[PDB]
Amino acid sequence: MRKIALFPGSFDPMTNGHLNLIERSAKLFDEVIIGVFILFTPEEKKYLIEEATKEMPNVRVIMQETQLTVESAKSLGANFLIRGIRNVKDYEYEKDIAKMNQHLAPEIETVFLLAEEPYAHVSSSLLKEVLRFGGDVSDYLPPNIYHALKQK
Amino acid sequence: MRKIALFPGSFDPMTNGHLNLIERSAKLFDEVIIGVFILFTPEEKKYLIEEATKEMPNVRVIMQETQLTVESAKSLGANFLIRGIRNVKDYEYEKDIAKMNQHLAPEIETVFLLAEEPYAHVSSSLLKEVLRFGGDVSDYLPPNIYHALKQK
Amino acid sequence: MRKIALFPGSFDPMTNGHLNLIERSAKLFDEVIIGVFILFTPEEKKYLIEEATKEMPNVRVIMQETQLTVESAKSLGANFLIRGIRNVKDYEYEKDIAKMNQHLAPEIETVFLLAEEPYAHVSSSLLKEVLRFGGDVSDYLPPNIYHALKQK
Amino acid sequence: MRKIALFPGSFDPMTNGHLNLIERSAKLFDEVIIGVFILFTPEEKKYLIEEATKEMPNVRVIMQETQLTVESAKSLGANFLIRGIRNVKDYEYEKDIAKMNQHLAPEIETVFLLAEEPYAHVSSSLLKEVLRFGGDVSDYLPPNIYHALKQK
Amino acid sequence: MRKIALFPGSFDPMTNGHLNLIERSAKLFDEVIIGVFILFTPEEKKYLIEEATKEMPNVRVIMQETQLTVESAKSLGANFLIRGIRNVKDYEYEKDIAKMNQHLAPEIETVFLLAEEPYAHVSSSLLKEVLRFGGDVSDYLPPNIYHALKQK
Amino acid sequence: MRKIALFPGSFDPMTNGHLNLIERSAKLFDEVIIGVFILFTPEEKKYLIEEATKEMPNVRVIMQETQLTVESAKSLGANFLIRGIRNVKDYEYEKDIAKMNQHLAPEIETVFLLAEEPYAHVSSSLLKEVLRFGGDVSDYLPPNIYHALKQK
Ligand SMILES: CC(C)(CO)[C@@H](O)C(=O)NCCC(=O)NCCS
Ligand SMILES: CC(C)(CO)[C@@H](O)C(=O)NCCC(=O)NCCS
Ligand SMILES: CC(C)(CO)[C@@H](O)C(=O)NCCC(=O)NCCS
Ligand SMILES: CC(C)(CO)[C@@H](O)C(=O)NCCC(=O)NCCS
Ligand SMILES: CC(C)(CO)[C@@H](O)C(=O)NCCC(=O)NCCS
Ligand SMILES: CC(C)(CO)[C@@H](O)C(=O)NCCC(=O)NCCS
């Protein structure tokens, strides 16, 4: 049977780091479900995310009204969560989340990949602040998300 | 003379991990004062914690108006602060605090215990995320505190 | 495609922590190969591990002349390497090895699992040091590897 | 490159640990510009900092309205950013900012000085919490900043 | 439990950091045993540490052939292991040990103290390197260990 | 103080990480000394490194017999030591080294630069093992050093 993974996240905004991880998990799982956990509408956001990922046949996007990620995985038939780790802070944060999740849904595995070195310093919080100051972060964004962004 | 330790905290809520550290430090010190720094009434928390720590004869609960923890310890004749460490982010946060405490009250020693591995991942803000979303976190709460909790 | 994973190690000795990781990874992958990179003769090492891992159909064991882990993975048709992370130290060490592996073989992906918490303090140098002083670590080794080690 | 450094920060308030980093980095660069990004009016903040740094003739203060730090460094002609690291959390944090700044302005180098161990536990939020409760942290502040502190 | 604490170590040499830890835990325990696990002879070693520790009435020195710490605890009748933590590397190291000891002897508690800031950088191995090149590390050693040391 | 830095190391072999640091520090100091502490004759190693660095007019190579890094600096008139940081581990190790050197020679300032992200996973123990086993690590070596490694 299939191995399906939920990639949860808020994707505000989606990054090349995000896509990179999406790309690589697409190679490892039969399928990958990107759960966007809800300025930019939930008709909008899914759009851009679907556009950015169209190249991979076994990926799809989903607006999850906010709720236990393991609930939402259980519903879609996901036995795997997939997450990236970029630095120690990130490791300890995800490790906590993964331990809670194993408590709530022990039959779900969290699986990790390391961020690719070009994207390891990138976090939405740092990104937004730079956007807000109008630095050029175009190299870190899927271009559709980029084109989309500059009506701000 | 008695060696008295103050265990500061807001116990919002108190976890089995807290209890474990209290149980462990009641073996270490002559007595342990649970300083609840201020959901429910200042009366009610006291009650609950007292209930949960009832089995430990040398442990008592004192609601504290917000002040310097070291001033609060000075007041009670506690020459020791007892803290847990659960992970590296925890270590660095507590270490800062102890050093500033050592600067403020050089006579008071902060002592540390490490979290028991079943609880190392449990923080109060994560516990609260799970509760918000309806997750079963009962194995992490003192039975009285869980019962007293369903009621809101 | 098809998803084949190399789990490299020295397994000196093989713990329940190793096993946990094998079992978890036996559910992610079409198949998982255990690379014993070379006390006891390789026959026994191979035998013990096979014996201890005899419940999982899609797991096999392979002795490896030590050599680059990425080459030995090419030979097996493994596109994946599977690793545990048990703490920060483990994290920084596997990260380095994973990037180098990626530079040596950008088509093998390294995949991570966090250690399950009864085993996250276990490492074979700690084990071996405890074993050398007569300490009881029977709970930490698979029964057969244990039974076998008492015989030597 | 000409040796011109921007030392950015909020200095709310300026500590001795700040003053220490300025003194050392004024031995390294031709000129050091203290970048104060906006309690007390920026007007008072300026006076106060130039009061504390008065003995170092190659140091000077500027009030910057928040804008990208690199952009402030360009308008000033500085090719060096100077930062302090006090612990691991701070390392990973400054590292992200430096990688991002290298992106926005790769001609600008970020340079690091390790916190002098008497001020390593000292951060702003901490100091202020202590001040909020009347703790004596006078040792951590340059006398001129203490004297100006008392009025509320 | 009786407030009897084992402070195990190789003490070669014993530094002012060790002594600082001993002094601080002599404020806490009724008995602090320095379990000295065996350059100079046992005798000389015993004599020097006894001499360094002479001002604390509840401290005694005991030589011990290398063995599991928790067996040496059992035999001496200590209920506590005391250890210091100087940085993150020390934190993860001590943590694994403490976890394994709890498994060996769950009735023995490990208690932790943070290193005092001025000795946080001193490890016995960095210190041997520096002595081995003739640097002046006399401030880091108890006056008497230092004399005894020139001589030999 | 005069902008004379020492860059101490064993350079076995020398990497592009090394070269990057040198290039960057060459922009910041008036003179950078490569301090080579002693497969190759020192004389060979000297010409190799000189050849790698030939393009920076303020850089120079000096062989030193093993000794306290700060004595070597003082001998050569360097007021600054320049080091790199690649990860948390390196950060904690450098930091102990810097504090000790500061105790030993408080007039000498240690200055840090963060490793560039292509080279941040590269350590000399890691390359050696890879060279041992025959892997193409040529994008991590300056060519002249690499060509020379075809020896035996
Ligand atoms: C958005 C995400 C994935 C980032 O860490 C995480 O915050 C998440 O799961 N949000 C939805 C709520 C949930 O399930 N919490 C359970 C915590 S054990
Ligand atoms: C911050 C907290 C909740 C847990 O670490 C606890 O330390 C706390 O609020 N204490 C009361 C305020 C105080 O004494 N702050 C100065 C500490 S140096
Ligand atoms: C699996 C490992 C790395 C221990 O973590 C170790 O078992 C290993 O690889 N041995 C073969 C040598 C190798 O391939 N080195 C290059 C790694 S970049
Ligand atoms: C004040 C300071 C230095 C503390 O970290 C930092 O917050 C800072 O840079 N503020 C200016 C805004 C900026 O340039 N942000 C993007 C950095 S990638
Ligand atoms: C070597 C020493 C004294 C610190 O310099 C201490 O760390 C130590 O534990 N020594 C060996 C005894 C032992 O029981 N090891 C297994 C621990 S689970
Ligand atoms: C080459 C180098 C710098 C890499 O860490 C390291 O090997 C080094 O320090 N060598 C010289 C010996 C020294 O000075 N030791 C004590 C410093 S407190």
Coordinates of C-alpha atoms in Angstrom, one line a residue, chain B residues 88 117 120-121, chain C residues 88 117-118 120:
Chain B
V88 CA 19.4 22.7 25.7
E117 CA 12.7 11.4 29.9
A120 CA 11.4 16.2 28.7
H121 CA 9.3 17.2 25.7
Chain C
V88 CA 22.5 17.9 19.5
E117 CA 13.2 8.2 24.4
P118 CA 14.2 5.0 26.3
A120 CA 18.3 8.5 23.4

